[PDB]
C-alpha cells in the first residue's frame, strides 16, 4: 500500500501540470529526476516544440520499454467541471482531472513499477526503458516518431514495448490491445500479471499511432491500462484502487518477462 501511495502522489503531481499538447509543463523533468536517482541513464530528445525522454536501466537485450505521453487534450469550459481540471482532487476513491485516465495515472504506475523492480533487482537481465513524449494527442510529427527514428539511426533495439494507454472497457484488466491496424513473451507476461493480480483474464483486441511507430522497430507492442470511459471528457477520473492495481500489474509483468 506504500507503493499504491507512491503511484497516487506521482499521478497528482503530473495531473497538476497543465500539459496541453505539445507543452510538457515539466512533467518529463519530474519523471527523469526520480529515475536518474535510481541509476537510469537519461537522454533528452527535444525537437521543435515537443519534449521527448528516453530513459534506460541496464545494458543487455532484451529491452522492455514502457511508452506513454505527458500531454493532455483541452479541458473545455470549466463551468462543466465539478473539480477544477488540474486540481488532482481525490473524491470518494476517484482521482479527478484532465489526464487522470489518459494517461498520467498509468504513466505514474509504469514509472513506480520500473523503480520498484530496479530497486529489488539492480543486476537484472536486459534493459528497462521509458519512452515518453509531450505530443501524442495532437499532430505528433515530432514526438514518439522522432525518438523511433533516432534509435533506428544508431541501430538501437526495442524488443518489447508496453504502451500504458487506458485499454480497459468495463473492468480493469478486461482488455489488452495488440497487433496491426490493418491486420509473444510480452502478451504472455501482461496476461499472467493481470490474472495473478486481479483474477481475471484479458481479452486481446486488434491502437495508438505511437504504438504503431514503435512496432516498426520490430518490437512486440502491447497496450494495457485503466478504464477508458472518461478519457477526453469533462470530469475525467480514475480509481485510486485501480492505480494501485496497475502498479502491481506492471511490476509483475517485469518479473514475468525478465
Ligand atoms: Zn488521448
Ligand atoms: Zn493517450
Residue numbers in the entry: -1 to 181, 188 to 210, 213 to 264
Task: Share the article's original sentences.
DapE hydrolyzes N-succinyl-L,L-diaminopimelic acid to L,L-diaminopimelic acid and succinate, is part of a biosynthetic pathway that is the major source of lysine in bacteria, and is essential for cell growth and proliferation. All the DapE enzymes characterized to date belong to the M20 family of dinuclear Zn(II)-dependent metalloproteases. In order to examine the role of the catalytic domain of DapE enzymes and the role of the active site loops, we have engineered the HiDapE and the DapE from Vibrio cholerae (VcDapE) by deleting their dimerization domains. Removal of the dimerization domain in DapE enzymes renders the enzyme inactive, even though the resulting truncated proteins have structures of the catalytic domain that are remarkably similar to WT-DapE and AAP.
